[PDB]
Amino acid sequence: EPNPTTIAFQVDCYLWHLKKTLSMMGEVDAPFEDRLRREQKALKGRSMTLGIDIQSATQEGYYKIKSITEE
Amino acid sequence: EPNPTTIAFQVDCYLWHLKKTLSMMGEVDAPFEDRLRREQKALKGRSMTLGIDIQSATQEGYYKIKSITEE
């Protein structure tokens, strides 16, 4: 079962994915996108430190958020 | 229609609500919670600066995210 560091990573990856999605739609401002770029580097770093692939973590994060939002 | 700054705020508020929800459930680690507290203060600040109420913005953010995730 996933530890809270792992769950925190999964959730962070998924939420970054949503924010990136909004950016690609042109829906958000420049400071939002700045934050998104810095966060991208931090998340890549954490991926390396934790040894967890971002794709996998993003999918898992999707499920975690799903579980708290259909509940 | 809301400009990209307003949308960025709405979305940030909603996503913070999700992260706080996870923290309240005891599911995330302490650095995630540190980030969460820092973010809570930043978002109160942006609420004052933009003159936008946090509850309403959180509601709007919910709708924006919903729209891109059932898409």
Q: Is A24 on the interface with B (CB under 8 A)?
A: no
B64, two tokens: 């924006």
Look up residue A17 and give its amino acid.
Answer: H
Cα distance between residue B15 and residue A12, in whole Å: 10
A11, two tokens: 């959730």
B65 contact residues in A (CB cutoff 8 A): 18
A2, two tokens: 């996933």
Q: A36 vs chain B: nearest CA distance in angstroms?
A: 11
Nearest residue in A to B18, CA atom = A65
A4 contact residues in B (CB cutoff 8 A): 26-29, 32
Q: Is A15 on the interface with B (CB under 8 A)?
A: yes
* Residue among B7, B12, B29 minimizing CB distance to A5: B29
Helices A4-24 and A30-50 cross at an angle (nearest 10°) of 150
What residue has token string 């509850």?
B55
With b for 16 or more beta-carbon neighbours within 10 A and e for fewer, the A52-62 pattern comes to bebeebbebbb
The structural domains of chain A, ordered by start, are 1-71 (1.10.287.10)
Cα distance between residue A50 and residue B41, in whole Å: 28
- Choose, out of A1, A10, A32, A33, the residue to mutate when testing the contact with B (most B CBs < 10 Å): A32
B10, two tokens: 């709405």
Q: Number of helices and strands (H, E) in chain A?
A: 3, 0
A37, two tokens: 């770029």
Q: Could you tell me if A62 and A14 are in contact, meaning their C-beta atoms sit under 8 angstroms apart?
A: yes
A22 contact residues in B (CB cutoff 8 A): 7, 11, 64, 68
Q: Could you tell me if A21 and A8 are in contact, meaning their C-beta atoms sit under 8 angstroms apart?
A: no
Query: CA–CA distance from A68 to each of A18, A62, B10, B17, B45 (Å)?
Result: 16, 10, 19, 11, 27
Count how many residues are written for chain A. Answer: 71
